Amino acid sequence: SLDAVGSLETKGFPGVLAAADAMVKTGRVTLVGYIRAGSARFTIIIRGDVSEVKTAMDAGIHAVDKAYGAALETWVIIPRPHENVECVLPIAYNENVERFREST
Amino acid sequence: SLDAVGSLETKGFPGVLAAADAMVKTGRVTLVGYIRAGSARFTIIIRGDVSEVKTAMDAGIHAVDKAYGAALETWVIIPRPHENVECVLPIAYNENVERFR
Amino acid sequence: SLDAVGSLETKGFPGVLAAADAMVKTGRVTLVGYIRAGSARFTIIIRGDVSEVKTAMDAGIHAVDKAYGAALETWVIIPRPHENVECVLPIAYNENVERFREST
Amino acid sequence: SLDAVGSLETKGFPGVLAAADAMVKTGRVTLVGYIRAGSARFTIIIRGDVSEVKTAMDAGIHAVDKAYGAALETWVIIPRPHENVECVLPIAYNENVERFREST
Amino acid sequence: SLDAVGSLETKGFPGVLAAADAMVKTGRVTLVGYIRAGSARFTIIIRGDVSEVKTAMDAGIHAVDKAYGAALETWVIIPRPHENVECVLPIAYNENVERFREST
Amino acid sequence: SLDAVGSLETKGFPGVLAAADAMVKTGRVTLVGYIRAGSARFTIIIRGDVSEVKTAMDAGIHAVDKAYGAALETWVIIPRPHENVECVLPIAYNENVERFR
């Protein structure tokens, strides 16, 4: 998919839970996966139209502060990822989340 | 499920054991899973009605201090989590815990 | 099982080895499992009658000091753990340790 | 393959995502894999002609700064890696990325 | 087995390689396993008669200093481990090392 | 095998890639495996004649500095490792690397 990708990483799982919920409730985006990065850091990945990923990312960043003890470590938006990156890195749509992609 | 979700994370396993036991003894909630987060941190996840998750979370927060050397690192309650989140993050009810629902 | 649970976590494996041996030799308790917690920390879990878990735990705490370089990080006793906790967390009796439960 | 190898490692996943996308869009190179290195560090590996790996690597280094909170930790280019290194370390071309090698 | 157990943990793998080789060359002991403990710490476990484990452990401790950059973090000798500890923790003899046990 | 063993560990993967390539290009040695040690440290292991492992290790130590941001954390050479060590620790020749022997 050439949809934009957003990635956000928190210290602690509760922060990433808060961010993920805000993202998919505010932008027409699909949460496609998460990573245990080590050192109690967790990464989440969303896909969607670039403008919707921007809106979702802002909501996710602000939601991290609603989780006691959570910290926002790092985030990025890649507006139009190369197929090789989507293939190798864990950022692709998958069959588990297809029905949410259809909904966007 | 549209049930509320609570998640709490401690430094050390004993603290998460203390917290989890307090949660399910005080709220009508289901402990659905836990995560080894790395750095000796452990995450637990509960589901239930919003009122019961809040009650359980309060009891769990206070219970962490009963474990010598434990620290409460972070926690959150999401009253009405989006179905997409439940699908990807390890927060769903599962068949292992069905009898506790 | 409604038996009490004790859990103890050390910095380094040698400390948890010392503690486990002291625990099962002091109380009528079963060591049911251990966890690699990360950051070179190791968790052990015992089950048994609450009074036996208390005496075993006392011995385990003191035994950690017998390992050079070990640190006792954290421990707890839960006298009557809820079945949902026993199910999800790695604290249940299991078939690998059945013969030790029988002997207690 | 005697193609050069480039490897770059960031603090946080978003930085490695930014770097990978820049690399494969700038040089005629293939992203062959990534590593979760621990401590929330992530490694990516590209292969291609040495001149293409150099230009891709330059773009990847600069792209890390486009991810909030990311840090560039370490990187290297090996112009003509030994077959024993390609065998043991996770740097070989693989069937998952064949179509991207063909296009280079 | 009621043979003694020795456990030694280093920062870095080279230190544990040095210690393991010194142990089995100096005491009539068997190296039965190792653990990746996290945080670049490595644990090794030897078994044998208590006096031989003592001799091996001293040689292993001194060998750690022969590895550049290695640090000895923690160690213990448990002279006669309870069968429950041997069962749950990774300290038992195994079929991979039987021929070295026979040799001791 | 009674061949010598060398092991070297870096902070970051690029440093270990640099070191490994220098080793097999300078000594008649076989790189038999590597370890993700945690904390972004990576271990590599070579086997060969004592003289070749020493030569390869020297080249590998110097090569770590050619990787931006890499650090050499620790290394050792065991000229004649005990067979018990080869059995338990991941330092043996293996079928994946047979052609390099």
UniProtKB/Swiss-Prot annotation, chains B, F:
One of its GO terms (biological process) is photosynthesis. GO terms for cellular component: carboxysome. One of its GO terms (molecular function) is structural constituent of carboxysome shell. InterPro entries: BMC_dom (IPR000249), BMC_shell (IPR050575), CcmK (IPR046380), CcmK-like_sf (IPR037233), CcmK/CsoS1_BMC (IPR044872). Its main location: other. PANTHER family: CARBOXYSOME SHELL PROTEIN CCMK4, PROPANEDIOL UTILIZATION PROTEIN PDUA. HAMAP family: CcmK (MF_00854). The tight homohexamer forms a small pore which is positively charged. Belongs to the bacterial microcompartments protein family. CcmK subfamily. This is Carboxysome shell protein CcmK4. The lineage of its organism: Bacteria, Bacillati, Cyanobacteriota, Cyanophyceae, Oscillatoriophycideae.
